[PDB]
Swiss-Prot record, chain A:
Bilayer-crossing regions: 19-39
Summary of the function given for this chain in its UniProt record: Ionotropic glutamate receptor that functions as a ligand-gated cation channel, gated by L-glutamate and glutamatergic agonists such as alpha-amino-3-hydroxy-5-methyl-4-isoxazolepropionic acid (AMPA), quisqualic acid, and kainic acid. L-glutamate acts as an excitatory neurotransmitter at many synapses in the central nervous system and plays an important role in fast excitatory synaptic transmission.
Coiled coil: none
Lineage top rank: taxon: Eukaryota
Intramembrane sections: 50-65, 66-68
Note: The postsynaptic actions of L-glutamate are mediated by a variety of receptors that are named according to their selective agonists. This receptor binds AMPA (quisqualate) > L-glutamate > kainate.
The protein, known as: Glutamate receptor 2
Subcellular location(s) of the protein: Cell membrane; Postsynaptic cell membrane; Postsynaptic density membrane
């Protein structure tokens, strides 16, 4: 039989990892940003900046390996970052 | 919500919600892993799907 | 006489291997590549959640040191 060309799917780049992994990356993304906000904004906090909009932006920059504007300065913040 | 005084009740309740979701993740991760390897050990056949 | 002519070896090759259901090249020909499953990289998730819980325990004992000071 003559070989014919098969068109790949448009989301075929997502194939080296299984779909069960791509779900857990999003769950791990939300989980770190919630914990990093709680562990930074305690009751005596100084001059802290890690709000929830900064904490989602810090975790997004860390996964893409593109750097960050600001870093954690508290020890419990450096643990959850590392 | 009944007693707005003694403000510590909202903060402690926030911790129980966060520890709830983290317990649910390791529940799902251990669940999906325990399912996936059980498909893996079975011997493959040309006539069986 | 049959052993030196290779007739006893030709008969054993026929009934054992040619009548075999799966050959050596039969299982060798089938290859496939698979995506990574969760069970491979499951340990990194276990380090991650355990890294989260230790950060909360440090935050408790630091505030207790701040209250004493
Ligand atoms: C993407 C989907 C939505 C994600 C959030 C949208 C943008 C967040 C935002 O920009 O506003 C949220 C603001 C923080 O921003 P801020 O400018 O007030 O900084 C001041 C921060 N401070 C006071 C601590 C210094 O926090 C607030 O007001 C209240 C925050 C409560 C609602 C935020 C949504 C929570 C979702 C968490 C993840 C769940 C899955 C999605
Ligand atoms: C108690 C509180 C904390 C004490 C330290 C925790 C345990 C120390 C680990 C250790 O001393 O034992 C080294 C182990 C042994 O190796 P194995 O278990 O693989 O051998 C198994 C062989 N097999 C694969 C055939 C089954 O290896 C491991 O546990 C490797 C586990 C990974 C730990 C490091 C990952 C994070 C590193 C840096 C991140 C930033 C640091 C924090 C900021």
């Amino acid at each position: 039989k003559k070989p014919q060309k098969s068109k790949p799917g448009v989301f075929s780049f997502l194939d080296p990892l299984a779909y069960e992994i791509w779900m857990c990356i999003v769950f791990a993304y939300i989980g770190v940003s919630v914990v990093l906000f709680l562990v930074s904004r305690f009751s005596p906090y100084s001059t802290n900046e890690f709000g929830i909009f900064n904490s989602l932006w810090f975790s997004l920059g860390a996964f893409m390996q593109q750097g960050c504007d600001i870093s954690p300065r508290s020890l419990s913040g450096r643990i959850v970052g590392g | 919500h009944i007693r707005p005084h003694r403000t510590i009740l909202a903060f402690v309740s926030g911790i129980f919600f966060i520890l709830s979701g983290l317990s649910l993740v390791v529940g799902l991760v251990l669940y999906i892993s325990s399912i996936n390897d059980e498909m893996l050990n079975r011997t493959k056949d040309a006539e069986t799907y | 006489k049959l052993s030196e002519q290779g007739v006893l070896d030709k008969l054993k090759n026929k009934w054992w291997y040619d009548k075999g259901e799966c050959g050596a090249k039969d299982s060798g020909s089938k290859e496939k590549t698979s995506a990574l499953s969760l069970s491979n990289v499951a340990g990194v998730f276990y380090i991650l959640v355990g890294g989260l819980g230790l950060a909360m325990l440090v935050a408790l004992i630091e505030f207790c040191y701040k209250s004493r000071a």
